[PDB]
Paper text:
The [name] twisted filament features a half pitch of ~154 nm, a helical rise of 2.41 Å, and a helical twist of −179.72°. Unlike the gS87 and unmodified WT α-syn fibrils formed under identical condition, the entire N-terminal region participates in fibril core formation in the [name] fibril. While, the phosphorylated S87 is excluded from the fibril core, and remains flexible and invisible from cryo-EM. Starting from residue 73, the extended C-terminal region (residues 73-140) remains highly flexible in the fibril structure, without electron density. In the [name] fibril structure, residues 1-29 from the N-terminal form a U-shaped structure stabilized by two pairs of salt bridges, including K6 & E20 and K21 & D2. The second U-shaped structure is formed by residues 30-49, stabilized by a salt bridge between K32 and E46 and a hydrogen bond between K34 and Y39. β2 (residues 26-29) forms a steric zipper-like hydrophobic interaction with residues 52-55, connecting the two U-shaped structures.
α-Synuclein forms amyloid fibrils that are critical in the progression of Parkinson’s disease and serves as the pathological hallmark of this condition. Different posttranslational modifications have been identified at multiple sites of α-synuclein, influencing its conformation, aggregation and function. In this study, we focus on α-syn S87, which can be modified by both phosphorylation and O-[name].
Numbering used by the authors:
A (entry chain C), B (entry chain A), C (entry chain B), D (entry chain F), E (entry chain D), F (entry chain E): 1 to 72
Write the structure that this text describes.
Amino acid sequence: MDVFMKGLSKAKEGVVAAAEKTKQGVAEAAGKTKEGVLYVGSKTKEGVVHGVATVAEKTKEQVTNVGGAVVT
Amino acid sequence: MDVFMKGLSKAKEGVVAAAEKTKQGVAEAAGKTKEGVLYVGSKTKEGVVHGVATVAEKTKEQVTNVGGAVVT
Amino acid sequence: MDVFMKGLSKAKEGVVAAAEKTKQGVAEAAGKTKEGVLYVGSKTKEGVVHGVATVAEKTKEQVTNVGGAVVT
Amino acid sequence: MDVFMKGLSKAKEGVVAAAEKTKQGVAEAAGKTKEGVLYVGSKTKEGVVHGVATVAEKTKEQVTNVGGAVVT
Amino acid sequence: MDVFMKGLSKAKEGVVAAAEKTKQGVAEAAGKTKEGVLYVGSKTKEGVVHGVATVAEKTKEQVTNVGGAVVT
Amino acid sequence: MDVFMKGLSKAKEGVVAAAEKTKQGVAEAAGKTKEGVLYVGSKTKEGVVHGVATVAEKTKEQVTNVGGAVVT
């Protein structure tokens, strides 16, 4: 539940770039997150949690652009 | 539950860049986070949590841009 | 639950850069965080937590930009 | 956005009564309430607010029952 | 945004009564309340707020019951 | 945003009563309350606030019960 607002992003002879909560080359395994969570008289059971992640880029001469400007 | 607001991002003969809570080349394993969490008369059980992560970039001549401007 | 506000980010013949709580080349394993967490008459049990993380960049001639400007 | 849950309300030779957030003989005028309200880059204007309320019961021998049991 | 939970309200040869956040004979005028309210880059204007309330019960021999048991 | 939890309210040859944040015979005028309120880069203007409240019960032989048991 994220809110993103941008009023009047004006650019003239320039660059108005903006990159929010971006993931790039990220490996996550068996993680638990909780935001704005309410438990009232509740029960929760959970067994073994097994997770494995991997991010392997073998790269050369890459131009990656998640938002913004790249002039090469 | 994050809120991102930007009013009048104006640029002229320049650069207005902005990068928020970005992850890049990040490895997370078996982590637990809690933000704004309320437990009321609740029970929670959890078994073994096994996690493994890996981020390996073998790279040369990379131009990565998550927001902003890159002029090369 | 983070709040990001920026009013009138104006740039002229210059650079207005901003990078918030960014992670880059970060390895986390079996960590527990708690922000604004309330326990009321609650029980919580947890088993063995096993985690392993790794971030290995073997790199040369990289131009990484998470927000801001990079002119090379 | 209220939640009301009742599990196994059992009664035997007795009374299981329950009255939640009830109003009775209540007068409200020109009040403003806000619960879980989020304003993001918003404008709000409001003129004169004129309100008048009145609750007048001229009564005798009344048996009022909002939930529960009344044995007279 | 209130939560009401009741597990196993059992009664035998007795009374299990419960009255939550009840108003009775209450007069409110020109009051402002705020619970869990977030303002982000917002403007709010408000004019004169005029309010008047009144609760007048001229009563005799009344049996009022908002939840619970009344045996008379 | 109030939370009300009750587990196993059992009664036998007795009384299990419970009254939470109840108002009765309460007069409020031009009051301002704030709970868990966050202002970020926000403006708020407010004019004259005029309020008047009144609670007048002229009563005899009243049996009022907001939760609990009344045996008369």
